[PDB]
Amino acid sequence: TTEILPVSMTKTSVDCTMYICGDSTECSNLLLQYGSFCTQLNRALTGIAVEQDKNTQEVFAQVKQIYKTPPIKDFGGFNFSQILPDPSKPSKRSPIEDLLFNKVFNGLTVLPPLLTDEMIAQYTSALLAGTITSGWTFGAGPALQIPFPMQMAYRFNGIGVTQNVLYENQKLIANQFNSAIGKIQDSLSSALGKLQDVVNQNAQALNTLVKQLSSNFGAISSVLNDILSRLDPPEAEVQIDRLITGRLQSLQTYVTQQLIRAAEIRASANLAATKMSECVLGQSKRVDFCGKGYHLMSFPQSAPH
């Protein structure tokens, strides 16, 4: 079965002055009277843009070496070809990592993540070659190779079945595994709503932020070049302040709701980091933590966020 988890969201930056005033010295001097609100807002957004890279680093950099798989791949009848990297593909992704990447202005900028998608696909292929080839030994020290069916027999021991039950049913167990990996590919090729929702929420908030640059909040217009053209300076101060107050309110609402949304993405990434440790580099005994049934093994695949 599959389990999908968000680890990051998009790093955005705002420039308070360019959003509230938009390069006009009249508004910019009135803004100085509000103290340091706009250094706080930037501090908050920077603090949440650094932890988005910290979120990814702790889910995926769970290896010291980059392990590679052997050229001649005989794993006892088991076939991992749809989850192993594909050189003729974009970014050297696996076949199933592709189906996943296909399914999902004024003081505002978007910062790029520190790890590219190529680097994260490299990390997951090192985890996947470590587990196909060494079992759980590489997550405790140096990787020690073991033939794949003997590793499968150890895992059967771990759920309380004897080893002869694996060795006498090897071809049937391998056929069932291959046929069940073949169905993930259909069900996805034909479900990533948890990843789509965090994208949608962030875009819906960024659009609401820009759509507020066209409200009066109780002024004669929404344009500073219209209050600076049909009002004398003593009368345009009163009308510029009404815009400043509204735009500050809207920017600070945006920054609060991002803190509350980042605290939720953080817990999801903390759960993903625990599942990578306990289901991918080990065999778990916890009930319903690594699927439904008796956990044998787990494989990671990277997704957009």
Partner: protein
């Protein structure tokens, strides 16, 4: 001198060709560091490569241990 990344335009750092561990994150895969005496910018490395001697009748068994704290 002047180097174009995907994070922006970077001035005052030399673009070397080797890959080290990340020291100061620039972004989109690029990091910077003070080497030798100058400031250099490079693509980060994920780690050292390793092929495991996998075959279908080979096993590796440890003969000693360490206590770690």
């Amino acid at each position: 001198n002047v180097f174009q990344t995907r994070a922006g335009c970077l001035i005052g750092a030399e673009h070397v060709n080797n890959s080290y561990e990340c020291d100061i994150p620039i972004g989109a895969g690029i990091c910077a560091s003070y080497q030798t005496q100058s400031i250099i910018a490079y693509t980060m490395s994920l780690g050292a490569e390793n092929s495991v001697a996998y075959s279908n009748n080979s096993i590796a068994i440890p003969t000693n241990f360490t206590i770690s704290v």
